[PDB]
Amino acid sequence: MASLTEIEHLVQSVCKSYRETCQLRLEDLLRQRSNIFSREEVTGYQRKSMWEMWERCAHHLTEAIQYVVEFAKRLSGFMELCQNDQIVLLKAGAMEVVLVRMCRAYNADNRTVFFEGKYGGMELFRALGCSELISSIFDFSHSLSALHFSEDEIALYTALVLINAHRPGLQEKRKVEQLQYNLELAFHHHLCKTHRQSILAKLPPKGKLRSLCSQHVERLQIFQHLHPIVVQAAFPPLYKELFSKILHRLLQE
Numbered sequence: 191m192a193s194l195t196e197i198e199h200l201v202q203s204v205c206k207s208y209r210e211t212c213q214l215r216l217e218d219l220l221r222q223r224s225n226i227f228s229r230e231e232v233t234g235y236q237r238k239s240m241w242e243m244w245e246r247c248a249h250h251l252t253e254a255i256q257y258v259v260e261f262a263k264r265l266s267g268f269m270e271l272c273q274n275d276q277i278v279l280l281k282a283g284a285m286e287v288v289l290v291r292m293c294r295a296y297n298a299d300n301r302t303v304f305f306e307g308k309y310g311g312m313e314l315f316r317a318l319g320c321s322e323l324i325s326s327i328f329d330f331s332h333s334l335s336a337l338h339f340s341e342d343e344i345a346l347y348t349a350l351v352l353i354n355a356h357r358p359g360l361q362e363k364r365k366v367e368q369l370q371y372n373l374e375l376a377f378h379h380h381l382c383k384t385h386r387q388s389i390l391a392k393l394p395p396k397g398k399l400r401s402l403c404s405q406h407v408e409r410l411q412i413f414q415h416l417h418p419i420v421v422q423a424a425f426p427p428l429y430k431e432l433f434s435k436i437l438h439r440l441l442q443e
Protein backbone atom coordinates (compact mmCIF):
# COMPACT_ATOMS: atom_id res chain seq x y z
CA MET A 191 0.00 0.00 0.00
CA ALA A 192 2.69 2.52 1.32
CA SER A 193 4.29 5.21 -0.90
CA LEU A 194 7.66 7.11 -0.76
CA THR A 195 7.85 9.95 1.93
CA GLU A 196 5.28 7.69 3.79
CA ILE A 197 8.02 4.96 3.79
CA GLU A 198 10.62 7.69 4.69
CA HIS A 199 8.56 8.85 7.73
CA LEU A 200 8.54 5.18 8.88
CA VAL A 201 12.43 5.16 8.91
CA GLN A 202 12.43 8.24 11.16
CA SER A 203 9.65 6.84 13.37
CA VAL A 204 11.44 3.47 13.84
CA CYS A 205 14.76 5.15 14.71
CA LYS A 206 12.98 7.41 17.29
CA SER A 207 11.33 4.39 19.02
CA TYR A 208 14.72 2.69 19.24
CA ARG A 209 16.60 5.85 20.49
CA GLU A 210 14.00 6.16 23.29
CA THR A 211 13.96 2.54 24.39
CA CYS A 212 17.73 2.32 24.66
CA GLN A 213 18.91 0.71 27.94
CA LEU A 214 22.27 2.55 27.73
CA ARG A 215 23.24 5.54 25.58
CA LEU A 216 25.77 4.59 22.82
CA GLU A 217 27.85 7.71 23.62
CA ASP A 218 28.19 6.74 27.34
CA LEU A 219 29.06 3.13 26.34
CA LEU A 220 31.99 4.15 24.12
CA ARG A 221 33.06 6.57 26.94
CA GLN A 222 33.42 3.70 29.47
CA ARG A 223 35.55 1.46 27.18
CA SER A 224 38.66 2.29 29.29
CA ASN A 225 36.99 1.10 32.58
CA ILE A 226 38.17 -2.54 32.37
CA PHE A 227 37.64 -4.73 35.49
CA SER A 228 40.83 -5.57 37.44
CA ARG A 229 42.15 -9.18 37.50
CA GLU A 230 40.95 -9.18 41.20
CA GLU A 231 37.37 -8.00 40.35
CA VAL A 232 37.27 -10.69 37.60
CA THR A 233 38.29 -13.34 40.19
CA GLY A 234 35.47 -12.15 42.47
CA TYR A 235 32.90 -12.98 39.73
CA GLN A 236 34.59 -16.28 38.91
CA ARG A 237 34.44 -17.20 42.65
CA LYS A 238 30.67 -16.43 42.94
CA SER A 239 28.25 -19.34 43.34
CA MET A 240 26.75 -20.61 40.04
CA TRP A 241 23.22 -19.78 41.16
CA GLU A 242 24.16 -16.28 42.38
CA MET A 243 25.77 -15.58 38.97
CA TRP A 244 22.79 -17.04 37.11
CA GLU A 245 20.28 -14.95 39.06
CA ARG A 246 22.46 -11.81 38.58
CA CYS A 247 22.43 -12.52 34.81
CA ALA A 248 18.72 -13.43 34.75
CA HIS A 249 17.89 -10.07 36.33
CA HIS A 250 20.02 -8.31 33.66
CA LEU A 251 18.37 -10.17 30.80
CA THR A 252 14.88 -9.34 32.25
CA GLU A 253 15.77 -5.63 32.55
CA ALA A 254 16.94 -5.63 28.85
CA ILE A 255 13.88 -7.55 27.64
CA GLN A 256 11.68 -4.95 29.44
CA TYR A 257 13.22 -2.21 27.20
CA VAL A 258 12.45 -4.37 24.09
CA VAL A 259 8.81 -4.61 25.21
CA GLU A 260 8.74 -0.78 25.44
CA PHE A 261 10.37 -0.59 21.97
CA ALA A 262 7.70 -2.97 20.58
CA LYS A 263 4.98 -0.72 22.14
CA ARG A 264 6.33 2.40 20.37
CA LEU A 265 6.87 0.39 17.13
CA SER A 266 4.65 1.74 14.33
CA GLY A 267 1.80 -0.71 13.78
CA PHE A 268 2.79 -3.15 16.56
CA MET A 269 0.26 -1.98 19.16
CA GLU A 270 -2.26 -1.79 16.17
CA LEU A 271 -2.04 -5.70 16.08
CA CYS A 272 -4.12 -8.13 18.27
CA GLN A 273 -2.87 -8.95 21.78
CA ASN A 274 -2.31 -12.65 20.91
CA ASP A 275 0.12 -11.78 18.06
CA GLN A 276 1.83 -9.14 20.21
CA ILE A 277 2.67 -11.84 22.76
CA VAL A 278 3.61 -14.31 19.91
CA LEU A 279 6.08 -11.72 18.48
CA LEU A 280 7.64 -10.74 21.78
CA LYS A 281 7.87 -14.30 23.08
CA ALA A 282 10.09 -15.07 19.97
CA GLY A 283 11.71 -11.71 19.14
CA ALA A 284 12.60 -10.22 22.58
CA MET A 285 15.67 -12.48 23.14
CA GLU A 286 16.98 -12.08 19.54
CA VAL A 287 16.51 -8.28 19.76
CA VAL A 288 18.58 -8.31 23.00
CA LEU A 289 21.24 -10.47 21.31
CA VAL A 290 21.45 -7.89 18.48
CA ARG A 291 21.37 -4.74 20.71
CA MET A 292 24.20 -6.11 22.89
CA CYS A 293 26.83 -5.45 20.20
CA ARG A 294 26.80 -1.72 21.18
CA ALA A 295 28.36 -2.70 24.53
CA TYR A 296 31.08 -5.00 23.05
CA ASN A 297 34.60 -3.67 22.40
CA ALA A 298 36.18 -5.64 19.55
CA ASP A 299 39.75 -4.35 20.22
CA ASN A 300 40.02 -6.05 23.63
CA ARG A 301 37.14 -8.61 23.06
CA THR A 302 35.18 -7.31 26.16
CA VAL A 303 31.57 -6.29 27.09
CA PHE A 304 30.10 -3.64 29.40
CA PHE A 305 28.77 -5.49 32.43
CA GLU A 306 27.93 -4.00 35.86
CA GLY A 307 29.68 -0.63 35.33
CA LYS A 308 32.87 -1.89 33.61
CA TYR A 309 34.12 -3.82 30.53
CA GLY A 310 35.11 -7.48 30.95
CA GLY A 311 35.97 -10.48 28.77
CA MET A 312 34.52 -13.97 28.38
CA GLU A 313 36.33 -15.14 31.60
CA LEU A 314 34.07 -12.91 33.75
CA PHE A 315 31.10 -15.27 33.28
CA ARG A 316 33.05 -18.51 34.02
CA ALA A 317 30.93 -19.23 37.12
CA LEU A 318 27.86 -19.85 34.90
CA GLY A 319 29.13 -23.20 33.65
CA CYS A 320 28.08 -22.73 30.03
CA SER A 321 31.39 -21.57 28.39
CA GLU A 322 30.06 -22.68 24.98
CA LEU A 323 27.01 -20.34 25.16
CA ILE A 324 29.24 -17.47 26.41
CA SER A 325 31.60 -18.13 23.46
CA SER A 326 28.62 -18.06 21.04
CA ILE A 327 27.27 -14.82 22.57
CA PHE A 328 30.70 -13.11 22.29
CA ASP A 329 31.32 -14.50 18.72
CA PHE A 330 27.88 -13.28 17.61
CA SER A 331 28.59 -9.82 18.99
CA HIS A 332 32.00 -9.93 17.30
CA SER A 333 30.50 -10.55 13.81
CA LEU A 334 27.69 -8.01 14.32
CA SER A 335 30.17 -5.33 15.44
CA ALA A 336 32.23 -5.96 12.25
CA LEU A 337 29.30 -4.54 10.25
CA HIS A 338 29.91 -1.11 11.99
CA PHE A 339 26.24 -0.48 12.45
CA SER A 340 24.77 2.98 12.50
CA GLU A 341 22.08 3.78 15.10
CA ASP A 342 19.45 3.91 12.28
CA GLU A 343 20.64 0.54 10.89
CA ILE A 344 20.61 -1.21 14.28
CA ALA A 345 17.08 0.27 14.82
CA LEU A 346 15.55 -0.99 11.52
CA TYR A 347 17.28 -4.36 11.72
CA THR A 348 15.89 -4.98 15.28
CA ALA A 349 12.34 -3.98 14.27
CA LEU A 350 12.70 -6.58 11.45
CA VAL A 351 13.96 -9.17 14.01
CA LEU A 352 10.81 -8.44 16.05
CA ILE A 353 8.25 -8.28 13.20
CA ASN A 354 8.42 -11.75 11.58
CA ALA A 355 5.34 -13.24 9.88
CA HIS A 356 6.98 -16.74 10.00
CA ARG A 357 6.11 -17.10 13.74
CA PRO A 358 3.91 -20.05 14.71
CA GLY A 359 0.75 -18.85 16.44
CA LEU A 360 -0.09 -15.73 14.40
CA GLN A 361 -3.86 -15.15 14.15
CA GLU A 362 -3.62 -12.19 11.78
CA LYS A 363 -0.65 -13.40 9.73
CA ARG A 364 -1.47 -11.10 6.75
CA LYS A 365 -1.50 -8.03 9.01
CA VAL A 366 2.02 -8.84 10.27
CA GLU A 367 3.11 -9.65 6.65
CA GLN A 368 2.15 -6.12 5.58
CA LEU A 369 4.14 -4.51 8.44
CA GLN A 370 7.17 -6.74 7.88
CA TYR A 371 7.12 -5.67 4.20
CA ASN A 372 6.84 -1.95 5.02
CA LEU A 373 9.75 -2.32 7.52
CA GLU A 374 11.80 -4.32 4.93
CA LEU A 375 11.25 -1.54 2.35
CA ALA A 376 12.15 1.13 4.94
CA PHE A 377 15.35 -0.72 5.89
CA HIS A 378 16.35 -1.24 2.25
CA HIS A 379 15.57 2.43 1.39
CA HIS A 380 17.81 3.70 4.17
CA LEU A 381 20.61 1.33 3.07
CA CYS A 382 20.10 2.49 -0.54
CA LYS A 383 20.05 6.25 0.35
CA THR A 384 23.11 5.89 2.68
CA HIS A 385 25.04 3.62 0.21
CA ARG A 386 25.10 0.77 2.73
CA GLN A 387 23.45 -2.09 0.73
CA SER A 388 26.76 -4.02 1.07
CA ILE A 389 25.88 -5.09 4.65
CA LEU A 390 22.84 -7.13 3.51
CA ALA A 391 24.96 -10.12 2.43
CA LYS A 392 27.33 -9.59 5.41
CA LEU A 393 24.35 -9.79 7.96
CA PRO A 394 23.88 -12.90 10.20
CA PRO A 395 22.09 -15.90 8.70
CA LYS A 396 18.63 -17.29 9.60
CA GLY A 397 19.64 -19.83 12.30
CA LYS A 398 22.49 -17.81 13.89
CA LEU A 399 20.09 -15.89 16.21
CA ARG A 400 17.76 -18.89 16.46
CA SER A 401 20.65 -21.18 17.66
CA LEU A 402 21.65 -18.78 20.48
CA CYS A 403 18.09 -18.80 21.87
CA SER A 404 18.00 -22.60 21.76
CA GLN A 405 21.44 -22.82 23.44
CA HIS A 406 20.15 -20.39 26.15
CA VAL A 407 16.96 -22.37 26.78
CA GLU A 408 18.95 -25.69 26.74
CA ARG A 409 21.42 -24.21 29.31
CA LEU A 410 18.59 -22.83 31.48
CA GLN A 411 16.63 -26.17 31.43
CA ILE A 412 19.97 -27.63 32.74
CA PHE A 413 20.43 -25.07 35.60
CA GLN A 414 16.65 -25.09 36.41
CA HIS A 415 16.92 -28.88 36.95
CA LEU A 416 19.85 -28.55 39.45
CA HIS A 417 18.41 -25.53 41.26
CA PRO A 418 14.61 -25.39 40.71
CA ILE A 419 13.92 -23.44 43.94
CA VAL A 420 16.50 -20.72 42.97
CA VAL A 421 14.50 -20.13 39.76
CA GLN A 422 11.15 -19.84 41.57
CA ALA A 423 12.37 -17.59 44.41
CA ALA A 424 15.24 -15.58 42.85
CA PHE A 425 14.49 -15.41 39.09
CA PRO A 426 12.34 -12.53 37.73
CA PRO A 427 8.76 -13.54 36.79
CA LEU A 428 9.14 -12.19 33.21
CA TYR A 429 12.28 -14.41 32.72
CA LYS A 430 10.31 -17.47 33.83
CA GLU A 431 7.33 -16.58 31.56
CA LEU A 432 9.58 -16.25 28.50
CA PHE A 433 12.03 -19.11 29.15
CA SER A 434 10.62 -21.71 31.63
CA LYS A 435 0.86 -12.83 32.38
CA ILE A 436 3.67 -10.17 33.06
CA LEU A 437 3.57 -9.34 29.32
CA HIS A 438 -0.18 -8.61 29.53
CA ARG A 439 0.51 -6.03 32.29
CA LEU A 440 3.47 -4.38 30.50
CA LEU A 441 1.50 -4.28 27.21
CA GLN A 442 -1.57 -2.51 28.62
CA GLU A 443 0.47 0.32 30.23
Ligand SMILES: CC(C)(O)C(=O)N[C@@H]1CC[C@@]2(S(=O)(=O)c3ccc(F)cc3)c3ccc(C(F)(C(F)(F)F)C(F)(F)F)cc3CC[C@@H]12
Nearest residue numbers: 247248250251254291292295304305315323324327328406
Ligand atom coordinates in the same frame (compact mmCIF):
# COMPACT_ATOMS: atom_id res chain seq x y z
C1 LIG B 1 23.85 -3.54 26.71
C2 LIG B 1 23.87 -4.67 27.73
C3 LIG B 1 23.43 -4.18 29.11
O1 LIG B 1 25.22 -5.14 27.84
C4 LIG B 1 22.96 -5.82 27.29
O2 LIG B 1 22.18 -5.67 26.36
N1 LIG B 1 23.07 -6.96 27.96
C5 LIG B 1 22.32 -8.17 27.60
C6 LIG B 1 21.25 -8.52 28.63
C7 LIG B 1 22.04 -9.22 29.74
C8 LIG B 1 23.15 -10.01 29.01
S1 LIG B 1 24.84 -9.74 29.90
O3 LIG B 1 25.30 -8.41 29.58
O4 LIG B 1 24.68 -10.10 31.29
C9 LIG B 1 25.95 -10.90 29.17
C10 LIG B 1 26.03 -12.19 29.68
C11 LIG B 1 26.90 -13.09 29.10
C12 LIG B 1 27.65 -12.69 28.03
F1 LIG B 1 28.47 -13.59 27.45
C13 LIG B 1 27.59 -11.43 27.51
C14 LIG B 1 26.73 -10.52 28.09
C15 LIG B 1 22.92 -11.51 29.18
C16 LIG B 1 22.59 -12.08 30.41
C17 LIG B 1 22.39 -13.44 30.53
C18 LIG B 1 22.51 -14.27 29.43
C19 LIG B 1 22.34 -15.77 29.56
F2 LIG B 1 21.83 -16.32 28.40
C20 LIG B 1 23.71 -16.47 29.74
F3 LIG B 1 23.58 -17.75 30.06
F4 LIG B 1 24.44 -16.40 28.64
F5 LIG B 1 24.42 -15.90 30.71
C21 LIG B 1 21.32 -16.16 30.68
F6 LIG B 1 21.79 -15.88 31.90
F7 LIG B 1 20.18 -15.49 30.53
F8 LIG B 1 21.03 -17.46 30.64
C22 LIG B 1 22.83 -13.70 28.21
C23 LIG B 1 23.04 -12.33 28.06
C24 LIG B 1 23.38 -11.79 26.70
C25 LIG B 1 22.76 -10.42 26.45
C26 LIG B 1 23.19 -9.44 27.55
